[PDB]
Swiss-Prot record, chain B:
UniProt similarity note: Belongs to the RNA polymerase beta' chain family.
Complexes and interactors: The RNAP catalytic core consists of 2 alpha, 1 beta, 1 beta' and 1 omega subunit. When a sigma factor is associated with the core the holoenzyme is formed, which can initiate transcription.
Cleavable signal peptide: none
Name this polypeptide is given: DNA-directed RNA polymerase subunit beta'
Stated role: DNA-dependent RNA polymerase catalyzes the transcription of DNA into RNA using the four ribonucleoside triphosphates as substrates.
Species whose genome carries this gene: Thermus thermophilus (strain ATCC 27634 / DSM 579 / HB8)
Cysteine pairings via disulfide bonds: none
């Protein structure tokens, strides 16, 4: 039964049950997030294990077993053996070093209780950026992709509040997704900030003139390197692919697509020309001294058409030689037996 | 399990305000730290501090509440060794096999 509410609800359910203290607890978790990486960074030292390892293995010990490591990203690492093994070394580390394992673990745990206490902090924000071209959910989803990305970076020591800090990164993440997923034909961020201007300028001109601006009014208005061919060209692209499937004519049954022809496929009269062309050129291929014919033959023919590095051994002057001569003899033995004359093309 | 404290004393509490008064982190004055009952392990004066922070000066402030949260779970402290199945629990300090 209709999504949206469930999530909006599921959030408030653990949000409405797990809100965070405006300072304290947030500052608490924070210290436990930073002392986390810092910790792990030392584990890697005392263990010659890549940070990427510790970070993962510590996460599973908390988030999920060997289950979440299998289906997500294939068995590169031993769901069973490899993971416990690593942990074995961590727990085997003397008090002085194991200290950090517990801190690491206690570290990632805090991250957990800092990302949730704001899932609504995202929703609110998302509430604004909406009708651009993404479900409310996605808009919220891409907002959370930003919430976390904002935790990895917050420095609690620099007294300024978290909530805020999150705002920035969140909007950052939503926009990207917007610019990057919004359409069917990928357009760059560049030619995006630029289309909006044009959409806008289109209105400023709608404002006073009355005549829907010619690609001149718009061009002058926009800026420098803006011609008339430019704006006209900018829009066809700023368009929206029309559904290959849409009611046409006295719309009833007749579906659009059936009005669009084909081209790759040669229609019977052409499939018959390659027939005649092939054989006839191939019959007029034999009445030749293969020593040079078969070089231009396959040249345009087989691979691709460069006269220089053309022939195997012999130099150039013998290329054109038999070329220009064979070609011509080839041209007049056909003038007689008129086969290609009436251009098969 | 009570959390962030304020200021009334400091009996058997956390390692946070162990710096606010070096006495018990370089020397050993906590034993004489009591205001006056020494003539006629955590503790502290009537009230000489705020909340949680790094006190080189106030570079880690957090003036607030004291959430006393109850977690329905069992609290062990001095577990030992019963080697029938793989080592479970911990020791008084040594191998915290967990």
């Amino acid at each position: 039964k209709i999504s949206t509410s469930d999530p909006v609800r599921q959030y408030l359910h653990e949000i409405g049950q797990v809100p965070l203290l405006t300072l304290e607890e947030e500052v608490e978790l924070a210290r436990k997030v930073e002392e986390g990486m810092e910790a792990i960074k030392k584990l890697s030292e005392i263990t010659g294990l890549d940070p990427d390892l510790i970070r993962e293995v510590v996460r599973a010990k908390i988030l999920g077993s060997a289950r979440v490591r299998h289906i997500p990203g294939l068995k590169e690492t031993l769901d069973p053996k490899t993971v416990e093994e690593i942990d074995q070394k961590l727990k085997s580390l003397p008090k002085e070093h194991k200290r950090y394992l517990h801190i690491a673990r206690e570290g990632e745990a805090a991250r957990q209780h800092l990302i949730e206490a704001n899932l609504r902090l995202v929703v609110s924000i998302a509430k604004k950026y909406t009708g651009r071209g993404l479900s409310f959910l996605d808009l919220i989803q891409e907002g959370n992709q930003g919430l976390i990305r904002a935790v990895e970076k917050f420095e609690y020591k620099r007294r300024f509040k978290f909530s805020t800090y999150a705002t920035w990164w969140i909007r950052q993440a939503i926009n990207r997704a917007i610019a990057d997923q919004a359409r069917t034909i990928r357009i760059p961020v560049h030619m995006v900030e630029t289309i909006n201007k044009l959409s806008r300028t289109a209105r400023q001109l709608q404002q006073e003139l009355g005549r829907e601006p010619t690609y001149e009014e718009i061009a002058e208005a926009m800026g420098p390197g803006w011609d008339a061919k430019r704006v006209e060209e900018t829009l066809k692209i700023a368009q929206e692919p029309v559904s290959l499937e849409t009611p046409i004519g006295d719309e009833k049954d007749s579906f659009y697509g059936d009005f669009i022809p084909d081209e790759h496929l040669p229609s019977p009269v052409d499939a018959a020309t390659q027939s005649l062309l092939s054989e006839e050129l191939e019959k007029a291929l034999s009445k030749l001294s293969e020593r040079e014919a078969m070089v231009l033959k396959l040249r345009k023919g087989l691979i691709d058409g460069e006269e220089v590095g053309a022939f195997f051994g012999v130099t150039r002057e013998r290329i054109r030689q038999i070329e220009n001569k064979a070609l011509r003899k080839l041209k007049y033995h056909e003038s007689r037996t008129r086969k290609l004359r009436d251009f098969l093309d | 399990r009570v959390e962030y404290v304020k200021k009334e004393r400091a009996g058997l509490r956390l390692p946070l305000a162990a710096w606010v008064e070096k006495e018990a982190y370089k020397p050993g004055e906590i034993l004489a730290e009591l205001p006056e009952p020494y003539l006629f392990g955590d503790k502290i004066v009537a009230a000489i501090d705020p909340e949680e922070e790094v006190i080189a000066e106030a570079e880690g402030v957090v003036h607030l509440h004291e959430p006393a949260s109850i977690l329905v779970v069992k609290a062990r402290v001095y577990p030992f060794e019963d080697d029938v199945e793989v080592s479970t629990g911990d020791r008084v300090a040594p191998g915290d096999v967990l």
